[PDB]
Amino acid sequence: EVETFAFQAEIAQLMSLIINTFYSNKEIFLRELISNSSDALDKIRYESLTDPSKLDSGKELHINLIPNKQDRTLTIVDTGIGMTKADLINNLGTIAKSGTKAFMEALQAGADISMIGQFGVGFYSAYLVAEKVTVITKHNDDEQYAWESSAGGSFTVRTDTGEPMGRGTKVILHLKEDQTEYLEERRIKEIVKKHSQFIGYPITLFVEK
Ligand SMILES: CC(C)Nc1cc(-n2c3c(c4c2CC(C)(C)CC4=O)CCN(C)C3)cc2c1C(=O)NCC2
């Protein structure tokens, strides 16, 4: 079954601002999502030091970038801690509420959209380039879930019926028609080198056959 939820008022406001504001420096979405993945990887790595059985769901700690020109999708796969049903519906939304408020106040005070990460709401920069975002996730303590939103004030959460992941998160960016440059090998390499060169996990770009 598919459950539909309204985003927190502040989050819905941020999403509308990200989608409607004229801002050409859209490439920052990739460093924001890579940073989210890197943070999830740090979390599982740290937890595994006191409980090694937390890595029974996969020992490899990495990030994979998968562009798909046919489907017009850019997929970011990590083997991080993953997210529970509570994280997707309540927890992360509650955490994001305060940062979203602070970021929108900062934007009114002179700050630019690239500073989104300093407020811990960088995930939402995915909407600079994507018309729809699908998040497939698996945490050791819960089932595999699929979160999805095309903005408009709502998101859906369902138990994922697809291919089992083991542990981690897949962020599927259903790109806007004019944002296909982020599917080009050369462009992705340039973004990773400029903004994510010092990420402490291997970042593998999957080249299209
Ligand atoms: C284990 C938490 C910290 N990893 C993540 C958390 C988010 N994330 C975050 C936020 C949100 C999301 C994803 C979302 C779909 C739940 C929406 C949201 O508000 C707000 C606060 N941010 C600090 C993080 C996104 C991702 C991840 C992840 O594991 N991999 C990549 C995608």
Curated annotation (Swiss-Prot):
Disulfide bonds: none annotated. GO terms for molecular function: ATP binding; ATP hydrolysis activity; ATP-dependent protein folding chaperone; CTP binding; dATP binding; disordered domain specific binding; DNA polymerase binding; enzyme-substrate adaptor activity. Keywords: Acetylation, ATP-binding, Cell membrane, Chaperone, Cytoplasm, Host-virus interaction, Hydrolase, Membrane, Mitochondrion, Nucleotide-binding, Nucleus, Phosphoprotein, S-nitrosylation, Stress response, Ubl conjugation. It comes from the Eukaryota. ISGylated. S-nitrosylated; negatively regulates the ATPase activity and the activation of eNOS by HSP90AA1. It is found in: Nucleus; Cytoplasm; Melanosome; Cell membrane. GO terms for biological process: activation of innate immune response; cardiac muscle cell apoptotic process; cellular response to heat; cellular response to virus; chaperone-mediated autophagy; chaperone-mediated protein complex assembly; mitochondrial transport; neurofibrillary tangle assembly. The modification N6-acetyllysine is found at K43, K69. Changing G82D: Abolishes ATPase activity. Residues 1-209 are annotated as: Interaction with NR3C1. Molecular chaperone that promotes the maturation, structural maintenance and proper regulation of specific target proteins involved for instance in cell cycle control and signal transduction. Undergoes a functional cycle that is linked to its ATPase activity which is essential for its chaperone activity. This cycle probably induces conformational changes in the client proteins, thereby causing their activation. Interacts dynamically with various co-chaperones that modulate its substrate recognition, ATPase cycle and chaperone function. Belongs to the heat shock protein 90 family. Homodimer. Identified in NR3C1/GCR steroid receptor-chaperone complexes formed at least by NR3C1, HSP90AA1 and a variety of proteins containing TPR repeats such as FKBP4, FKBP5, PPID, PPP5C or STIP1. Forms a complex containing HSP90AA1, TSC1 and TSC2; TSC1 is required to recruit TCS2 to the complex. The closed form interacts (via the middle domain and TPR repeat-binding motif) with co-chaperone TSC1 (via C-terminus). Interacts with TOM34. Interacts with TERT; the interaction, together with PTGES3, is required for correct assembly and stabilization of the TERT holoenzyme complex. This is Heat shock protein HSP 90-alpha. It comes from Homo sapiens. The lineage of its organism: Eukaryota, Metazoa, Chordata, Craniata, Vertebrata. The gene is HSP90AA1.
